[PDB]
Amino acid sequence: ARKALIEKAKRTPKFKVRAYTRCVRCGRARSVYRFFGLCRICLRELAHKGQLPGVRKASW
Amino acid sequence: ERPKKEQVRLKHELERLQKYLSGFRLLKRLPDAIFVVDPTKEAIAVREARKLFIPVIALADTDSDPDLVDYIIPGNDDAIRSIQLILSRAVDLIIQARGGVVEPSPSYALVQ
Amino acid sequence: DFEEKMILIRRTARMQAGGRRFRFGALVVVGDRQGRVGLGFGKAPEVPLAVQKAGYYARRNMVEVPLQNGTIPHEIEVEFGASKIVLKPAAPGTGVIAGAVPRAILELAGVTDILTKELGSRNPINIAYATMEALRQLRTKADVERLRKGE
Amino acid sequence: GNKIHPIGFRLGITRDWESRWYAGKKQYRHLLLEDQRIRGLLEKELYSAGLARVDIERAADNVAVTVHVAKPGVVIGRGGERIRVLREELAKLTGKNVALNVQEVQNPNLSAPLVAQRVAEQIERRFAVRRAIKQAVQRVMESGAKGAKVIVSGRIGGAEQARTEWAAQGRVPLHTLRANIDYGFALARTTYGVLGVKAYIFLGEV
RNA sequence: UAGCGCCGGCCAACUCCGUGCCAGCAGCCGCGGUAAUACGGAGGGCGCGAGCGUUACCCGGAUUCACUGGGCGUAAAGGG
RNA sequence: UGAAACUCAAAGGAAUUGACGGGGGCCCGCACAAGCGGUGGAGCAUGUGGUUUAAUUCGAAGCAACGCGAAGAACCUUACCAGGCCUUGACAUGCUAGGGAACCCGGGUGAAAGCCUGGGGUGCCCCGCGAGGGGAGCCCUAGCACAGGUGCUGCAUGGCCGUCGUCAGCUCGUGCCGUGAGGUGUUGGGUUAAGUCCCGCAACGAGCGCAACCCCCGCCGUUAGUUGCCAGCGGUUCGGCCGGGCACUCUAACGGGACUGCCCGCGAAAGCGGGAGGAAGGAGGGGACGACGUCUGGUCAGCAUGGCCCUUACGGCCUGGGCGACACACGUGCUACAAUGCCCACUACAAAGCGAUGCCACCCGGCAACGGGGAGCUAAUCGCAAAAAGGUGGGCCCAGUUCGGAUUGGGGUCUGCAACCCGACCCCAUGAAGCCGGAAUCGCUAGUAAUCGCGGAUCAGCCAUGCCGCGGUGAAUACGUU
Ligand SMILES: [Mg+2]
Ligand SMILES: [Mg+2]
Ligand SMILES: [Mg+2]
Ligand SMILES: [Mg+2]
Ligand SMILES: [Mg+2]
Ligand SMILES: [Mg+2]
Ligand SMILES: [Mg+2]
Ligand SMILES: [Mg+2]
Ligand SMILES: [Mg+2]
Ligand SMILES: [Mg+2]
Ligand SMILES: [Mg+2]
Ligand SMILES: [Mg+2]
Ligand SMILES: [Mg+2]
Ligand SMILES: [Mg+2]
Ligand SMILES: [Mg+2]
Ligand SMILES: [Mg+2]
Ligand SMILES: [Mg+2]
Ligand SMILES: [Mg+2]
Ligand SMILES: [Mg+2]
Ligand SMILES: [Mg+2]
Ligand SMILES: [Mg+2]
Ligand SMILES: [Mg+2]
Ligand SMILES: [Mg+2]
Ligand SMILES: [Mg+2]
Ligand SMILES: [Mg+2]
Ligand SMILES: [Mg+2]
Ligand SMILES: [Mg+2]
Ligand SMILES: [Mg+2]
Ligand SMILES: [Mg+2]
Ligand SMILES: [Mg+2]
Ligand SMILES: [Mg+2]
Ligand SMILES: [Mg+2]
Ligand SMILES: [Mg+2]
Ligand SMILES: [Mg+2]
Ligand SMILES: [Mg+2]
Ligand SMILES: [Mg+2]
Ligand SMILES: [Mg+2]
Ligand SMILES: [Mg+2]
Ligand SMILES: [Mg+2]
Ligand SMILES: [Mg+2]
Ligand SMILES: [Mg+2]
Ligand SMILES: [Mg+2]
Ligand SMILES: [Mg+2]
Ligand SMILES: [Mg+2]
Ligand SMILES: [Mg+2]
Ligand SMILES: [Mg+2]
Ligand SMILES: [Mg+2]
Ligand SMILES: [Mg+2]
Ligand SMILES: [Mg+2]
Ligand SMILES: [Mg+2]
Ligand SMILES: [Mg+2]
Ligand SMILES: [Mg+2]
Ligand SMILES: [Mg+2]
Ligand SMILES: [Mg+2]
Ligand SMILES: [Mg+2]
Ligand SMILES: [Mg+2]
Ligand SMILES: [Mg+2]
Ligand SMILES: [Mg+2]
Ligand SMILES: [Mg+2]
Ligand SMILES: [Mg+2]
Ligand SMILES: [Mg+2]
Ligand SMILES: [Mg+2]
Ligand SMILES: [Mg+2]
Ligand SMILES: [Mg+2]
Ligand SMILES: [Mg+2]
Ligand SMILES: [Mg+2]
Ligand SMILES: [Mg+2]
Ligand SMILES: [Mg+2]
Ligand SMILES: [Mg+2]
Ligand SMILES: [Mg+2]
Ligand SMILES: [Mg+2]
Ligand SMILES: [Mg+2]
Ligand SMILES: [Mg+2]
Ligand SMILES: [Mg+2]
Ligand SMILES: [Mg+2]
Ligand SMILES: [Mg+2]
Ligand SMILES: [Mg+2]
Ligand SMILES: [Mg+2]
Ligand SMILES: [Mg+2]
Ligand SMILES: [Mg+2]
Ligand SMILES: [Mg+2]
Ligand SMILES: [Mg+2]
Ligand SMILES: [Mg+2]
Ligand SMILES: [Mg+2]
Ligand SMILES: [Mg+2]
Ligand SMILES: [Mg+2]
Ligand SMILES: [Mg+2]
Ligand SMILES: [Mg+2]
Ligand SMILES: [Mg+2]
Ligand SMILES: [Mg+2]
Ligand SMILES: [Mg+2]
Ligand SMILES: [Mg+2]
Ligand SMILES: [Mg+2]
Ligand SMILES: [Mg+2]
Ligand SMILES: [Mg+2]
Ligand SMILES: [Mg+2]
Ligand SMILES: [Mg+2]
Ligand SMILES: [Mg+2]
Ligand SMILES: [Mg+2]
Ligand SMILES: [Mg+2]
Ligand SMILES: [Mg+2]
Ligand SMILES: [Mg+2]
Ligand SMILES: [Mg+2]
Ligand SMILES: [Mg+2]
Ligand SMILES: [Mg+2]
Ligand SMILES: [Mg+2]
Ligand SMILES: [Mg+2]
Ligand SMILES: [Mg+2]
Ligand SMILES: [Mg+2]
Ligand SMILES: [Mg+2]
Ligand SMILES: [Mg+2]
Ligand SMILES: [Mg+2]
Ligand SMILES: [Mg+2]
Ligand SMILES: [Zn+2]
């Protein structure tokens, strides 16, 4: 239940309640930011890759 | 460019850079022989030279190892007297074999 | 430029908290198959680098060898502390008969007929060192009469 | 056992955003999503030429797609086909205005993601790992460069036990910001499976 | 008529399946505890051939009883 | 004096590197000491062991597993369990065959999935005036190739991460030394946070580390004037509201500025001590940054991947259950045991941040939550906001109390199809153990601990006492290194 997992994650054949997020890449279910539509992990990779506009190493 | 900071050390280097090389720096090939004031003392050199089949010559007192010197200058070598006397005529010989013999540099006063 | 041939490439090692690292022995001989010969023993954290390094040292330490038609002048025994090696002259058609080490030596030496044996220890390294010295102590009839003259 | 991604570390400097534009709390999500898959399709059909960097720009249906390649000829074709067919197939799937610009690569031996994809291959093609890795460096260094370093990790030679082969020459201060050190990575599939590849190229400074 | 031994290292000859501290191998070191160039079969290879292997014993290697040709501070060995 | 059987693939010398020592020397880190507060007791929350179960999915294991994957489990999620149903598939590409276009609408059925099934419909290509058919897409159905697997192996592996440890270390080239493993350099004197630097030296130099280059905070100048300002005048529904100005505040870019530079002492130097000037000194405070390598660390359930295993099922759908079970054991936590306090009224001072079917100003109704109306705001313009502790006034008077708020009953709002299992909140009533906690043990060296609130990620709502961040009030104590 991982391929059919991610498909059902788009359809919502019923009540808007069963609507849940999903990492666009990894297809993770949890730790997914609404902003990037991505899981925490993959984004860490993209951020390092520079492939994320403005996204930059924070420090204070 | 070069902050005041870098200038300091960078120059300071040069000083000791010269403080050991100024007299060796004119050598660029690789000596044909080596003149040594006290053999036993700077015997480390003798070894370097000897291995490279570079001829050894040196002033040497009794505190010395006569066999490992190719051209020996037996005699005192701890006192300025014998040292200045030998190096004098030694160099004068070099200059004369070359061209333009002159008169020994200050050293007699240095002797005091 | 001469000929090149290594006798062995062993991996030594050393302890140190958290594990063991290794350098690399590498003994190599080099010669023109015509009297000029030189042995070399290089060390480094890399097999290639090691043999390469042995190459530099090889051509450095060298030795001419008095060859009488592919054989050696007189027989000699030379004990390098540990091990000991014999060397004997032999007519053409005898061949180089010896342990793998002294072979490399004598072969790249241009030698082609010789009876020999490794007595005592046998550590490749020490037998190597041993043979070099042995050749380095061979003397032609001349050398003899030349010293035994002193006119 | 740490080492952060040299790139992300030099984000506020040196390496600029490979994808660089702007949006808001509604667009960023998709523009990125699309931007990504575009780069993906390009990794696919385009790597055959030495596809290293792939810069991108957007804002309002405007879309830059400057793809830097070691062999531009393969992205162009003969005069307007290979280059165009992509422009087609690209927007043929995007609802936007594209532009498949193409730079060259004055020297691949000075681009990590290239050096990487290179040594990444020879392993797949089953070859001397030590030799090849060490050669890539002596290529990149001899190729004129202030520093270089390369490293694979996995089943070198196909052994049971894992491993990792080190190799580098000339300064490569990964800790310093003013450094610019092209970073490269690449996979390597074999009978015995996965195998990582890393590349580091110290170039600029100050 | 063409056979036999071997192909981890010494030692000349490499892959695949099976197997799974079992079945087994073994001269020394060691090999097999799911992925074995070391078991067993196969394909291929090295060696010899009316033979090829094994066991047994003798000399060799063994300068390991040393005459040739060894040793004895701490390695076995100076006698209280 | 002195064997043998038997048995082992060694026994053993010296030297080398390293680890270890209830050996040593020099040295360091909230390591101990000094000191403040706290867990272990109680209640509850949360994770875990165990047992239980139809199932209570799986992983993580001393330090470095246990509010950890999970930054949001009613069904979704969901990998588990029971029951119903499909079995080239929920998704990929391909080849081929018969029927229909596409598309939209429904009825019988059932728990839903799924299965029986009427209607509308007739677009685009070829031939022909039509008929009729053939060709594309798209669907039904047949078949093959193939899907799919959170099934197994982190002891096959990439990636990423933990860790020793921000420790000061690890090592290379050539030379030299040793038969060699190896040694030197890197050691030694001084110095520092530091293999920091000086000095010395059979080494001379170089590389990864340390520092420095990047971000935040402190003083100040430049540019910018929809924030702030009567600083300054004038009008005032006396509110920086209108005029007016940017000076100051602030907002954000850029730059100045500190370098043991200056003075004095010691010192071969490096450096050290003390003084000025200075917003700030001897690294000013906080961050990001974590070397060779160690742990057969972690993770095949993020993803990737060698091998293996499944294949009308080890795959897929739904409905319900479970993950929330409870005789128990521990780990992190929250609220407390009250007068340096609890209550109630009234009044004041932040920061960072978030918000256009989101933030919701004000009115109305309600004890209330919440509902009805409704202005503004893509936002230094309106909104979440009341910060809280504080301040002043009143009440309680030492009690299991007006301490403490668990448990239980009753009534109600809101999200979401749905709140039995299982949400969150409101109001009334009920008012538990607990009177400072055994052996034992954690945190912290200054704007720190303690304390007090505010925000944000996630997300319908929320089981958040959790996490990440923000500001407010603001200590104690370090003789010393046994
Ligand atoms: Mg949800
Ligand atoms: Mg999520
Ligand atoms: Mg990239
Ligand atoms: Mg010269
Ligand atoms: Mg010369
Ligand atoms: Mg003599
Ligand atoms: Mg005088
Ligand atoms: Mg030649
Ligand atoms: Mg020649
Ligand atoms: Mg060659
Ligand atoms: Mg040597
Ligand atoms: Mg060299
Ligand atoms: Mg001659
Ligand atoms: Mg000769
Ligand atoms: Mg002897
Ligand atoms: Mg032997
Ligand atoms: Mg031996
Ligand atoms: Mg000679
Ligand atoms: Mg001669
Ligand atoms: Mg590649
Ligand atoms: Mg190729
Ligand atoms: Mg990466
Ligand atoms: Mg045989
Ligand atoms: Mg044989
Ligand atoms: Mg062979
Ligand atoms: Mg069996
Ligand atoms: Mg089996
Ligand atoms: Mg096998
Ligand atoms: Mg095995
Ligand atoms: Mg065998
Ligand atoms: Mg076999
Ligand atoms: Mg055969
Ligand atoms: Mg015959
Ligand atoms: Mg015998
Ligand atoms: Mg015998
Ligand atoms: Mg005998
Ligand atoms: Mg003996
Ligand atoms: Mg004797
Ligand atoms: Mg005995
Ligand atoms: Mg006697
Ligand atoms: Mg007697
Ligand atoms: Mg005795
Ligand atoms: Mg007696
Ligand atoms: Mg006896
Ligand atoms: Mg006996
Ligand atoms: Mg008996
Ligand atoms: Mg240890
Ligand atoms: Mg502590
Ligand atoms: Mg501290
Ligand atoms: Mg204490
Ligand atoms: Mg307690
Ligand atoms: Mg308790
Ligand atoms: Mg536990
Ligand atoms: Mg029971
Ligand atoms: Mg698992
Ligand atoms: Mg478990
Ligand atoms: Mg959670
Ligand atoms: Mg079932
Ligand atoms: Mg299909
Ligand atoms: Mg066909
Ligand atoms: Mg219907
Ligand atoms: Mg009807
Ligand atoms: Mg058509
Ligand atoms: Mg057409
Ligand atoms: Mg046509
Ligand atoms: Mg047409
Ligand atoms: Mg027509
Ligand atoms: Mg027509
Ligand atoms: Mg017509
Ligand atoms: Mg018609
Ligand atoms: Mg068509
Ligand atoms: Mg077509
Ligand atoms: Mg592991
Ligand atoms: Mg790993
Ligand atoms: Mg250490
Ligand atoms: Mg060291
Ligand atoms: Mg050392
Ligand atoms: Mg000393
Ligand atoms: Mg340094
Ligand atoms: Mg100012
Ligand atoms: Mg006024
Ligand atoms: Mg006035
Ligand atoms: Mg006035
Ligand atoms: Mg105004
Ligand atoms: Mg300055
Ligand atoms: Mg000074
Ligand atoms: Mg002062
Ligand atoms: Mg600082
Ligand atoms: Mg700091
Ligand atoms: Mg740093
Ligand atoms: Mg591991
Ligand atoms: Mg494990
Ligand atoms: Mg797995
Ligand atoms: Mg796998
Ligand atoms: Mg796989
Ligand atoms: Mg099955
Ligand atoms: Mg079956
Ligand atoms: Mg509104
Ligand atoms: Mg309201
Ligand atoms: Mg009211
Ligand atoms: Mg409300
Ligand atoms: Mg309302
Ligand atoms: Mg305003
Ligand atoms: Mg909120
Ligand atoms: Mg109060
Ligand atoms: Mg009062
Ligand atoms: Mg009571
Ligand atoms: Mg009511
Ligand atoms: Mg009691
Ligand atoms: Mg009391
Ligand atoms: Mg909060
Ligand atoms: Mg929320
Ligand atoms: Mg909180
Ligand atoms: Zn992801």
Rg (CA), chain B: 18
Instruction: Kindly determine whether residue A53 and residue D19, on different chains, have CB atoms separated by under 8 Å.
Output: yes
Q: What is the experimental resolution, given in Å to one decimal place?
A: 3.0
d(CA A47, CA A56): 7
**If you search the block for the tokens 């990149």, which residue do you land on?**
D140
Co-location of D100 and D115 in the same domain: no
Q: Which of A25, A35, A48 sits opposite D7 (nearest CB)?
A: A48
β pairing state of A38-39 and A32-33? antiparallel
Domain of residue A50 covers 1-60
Contact, C68 vs C54, CB < 8 A?
no
Amino acid letter at D73? Answer: G
Q: Which helix (H) or strand (E) holds D140?
A: helix D129-142
Residue D3 lies in a domain: no
The crossing angle, in degrees rounded to 10, of helices C124-135 and C100-108 is 30
Contact, B38 vs B82, CB < 8 A?
no
Domain of residue C43 covers 3-63
Nearest CA to C75 out of C91, C93, C89 is that of: C89
Co-location of D123 and D95 in the same domain: no
How many structural domains does chain C have?
Answer: 2
Residue D9 CB in 7 A reach of strand F: yes
Q: Which method was it determined by?
A: X-ray
CATH assignment at residue D206: 3.30.1140.32
d(CA C110, CA C100): 16
C25: three-class secondary structure by DSSP: strand
Residue D2 lies in a domain: no
Q: Which of D3, D11, D33 to mutate to test the interface with A (most CBs of A within 10 A)?
A: D11
Q: How many CB atoms lie within 10 A of CB C106?
A: 27
How many structural domains does chain A have?
Answer: 1
Task: Pick the last residue of a domain from C20, C35, C63.
Answer: C63
- DSSP of chain A: --HHHHHHHHH--S-GGG-----SSS--SSSEETTTTEEHHHHHHHHHHT-SSS------
Domain of residue D128 covers 107-206
Longest dimension (CA), chain A: 46
HEC sequence for B61-80: CCCCCHHHCCEEEECCCCCH
Co-location of C74 and C137 in the same domain: yes
Co-location of C72 and C144 in the same domain: yes
The crossing angle, in degrees rounded to 10, of helices D112-124 and D129-142 is 160
Q: Which helix (H) or strand (E) holds C102?
A: helix C100-108
The strand F neighbours among C residues 85-114, by Cβ under 7 Å, are none
How many structural domains does chain D have?
Answer: 2
Task: Pick the last residue of a domain from C20, C39, C63.
Answer: C63
Co-location of D29 and D100 in the same domain: yes
DSSP tag of C68? B
For the CA atoms of D157, D158, D162, D166, the dihedral, rounded to the nearest 10 degrees, stands at 20
CATH assignment at residue A2: 4.10.830.10
B47: three-class secondary structure by DSSP: helix
d(CA C43, CA B60): 40
Residue D7 CB in 7 A reach of strand F: no
Task: Pick the last residue of a domain from C63, C93, C112.
Answer: C63
Nucleotides of F under 7 A from a protein CB: 16-19, 69-80, 90-91, 113, 147-151, 156-165, 170-177, 179-183, 198-199, 202, 206-216, 259, 286-295, 297, 302-307, 315-319, 355-356, 416-418, 457-460, 470
Handedness of CA A25, A29, A35, A41 (dihedral sign): negative
Co-location of D147 and D205 in the same domain: yes
Task: Pick the last residue of a domain from D77, D106, D135.
Answer: D106
Task: Pick the last residue of a domain from D71, D106, D141.
Answer: D106
Residue B48 CB in 7 A reach of strand F: yes
B41: three-class secondary structure by DSSP: coil
Contact, C67 vs C35, CB < 8 A?
yes
CATH assignment at residue C28: 3.30.160.20
Residue D5 lies in a domain: no
> Which chain A residues touch D35 with a CB distance below 8 Å?
51
Residue D132 lies in a domain: yes
d(CA D203, CA C87): 59
Q: Tell whether A48 is within 8 A of chain D (Cβ).
A: yes
Nearest CA to D55 out of D21, D94, D25, D80 is that of: D21
Query: How deeply is A53 buried, as exposed, middle or buried, from its count of CB atoms within 10 A (0-12, 13-18, 19+)?
Result: buried
Co-location of D123 and D40 in the same domain: no
Nearest CA to A48 out of D34, D183, D181 is that of: D183
Nearest CA to D145 out of D118, D94, D108, D189 is that of: D108
- DSSP of C108-148: HTT--EEEEEEEE---HHHHHHHHHHHHTT---HHHHHHHT
